[PDB]
Design a protein around this ligand. Structure first.
Ligand SMILES: CN(CC1=NC(=O)NC(=O)C1)Cc1ccsc1
Length: 161
């Protein structure tokens, strides 16, 4: 069913989150954590206090796909063995957000071509800088396009709201 998913997404806020590589998404899926640069850390902390659910929709750069989506379960807090771009130190990251995965399945950009994001000039939702907010209706429809992830039980996530 899709009803518990719709409940989690009710009045949620949504953000497009990019990853430099697949390894960091794999680590995030295994450990339930994410980290960003300080600019997006501030945005996500403000949103976490502001809304019943904050949803991160992940896309590895140049992959042509989204790799899943998760709900923030905490504000950022201050070692995870991230695989960082050349020249980047771990000291350049903000804190660590805890996340609960809602779907670990992928969705190719070709399947979201009918959805536009009002907060990025109504461009297709796949288009946006890291941290771009996705308006509620667009974000809800995007999440509902993903294949169902029958390995996840949203009962536990609902209790955290
Ligand atoms: C786990 N982090 C991967 C990310 N990659 C990215 O492009 N944006 C992010 O919020 C997070 C570490 C990091 C942060 C800026 S580069 C590499």
């Amino acid at each position: 069913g899709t009803s518990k998913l719709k409940y989690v997404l009710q009045d949620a806020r949504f953000f497009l989150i990019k990853s430099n590589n697949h390894e960091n998404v794999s680590l995030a899926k295994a450990k339930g954590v994410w980290s960003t640069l300080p600019v997006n850390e501030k945005k996500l902390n403000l949103a976490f206090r502001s809304a019943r659910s904050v949803i991160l929709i992940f896309s590895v750069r140049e992959s042509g796909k989204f790799q899943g989506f998760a709900r923030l379960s905490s504000e950022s807090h201050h070692p995870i063995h991230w695989v960082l771009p050349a020249g980047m130190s771990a000291k350049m990251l903000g804190g660590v957000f805890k996340i609960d995965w809602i779907c670990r399945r992928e969705l190719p950009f070709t399947k979201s071509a009918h959805l536009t994001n009002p907060w990025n000039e109504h461009k297709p939702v796949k288009i946006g800088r890291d941290g771009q907010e996705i308006e509620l209706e667009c974000g809800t429809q995007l999440c509902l396009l993903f294949p169902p992830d029958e390995s996840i039980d949203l009962y536990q996530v609902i209790h955290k709201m």
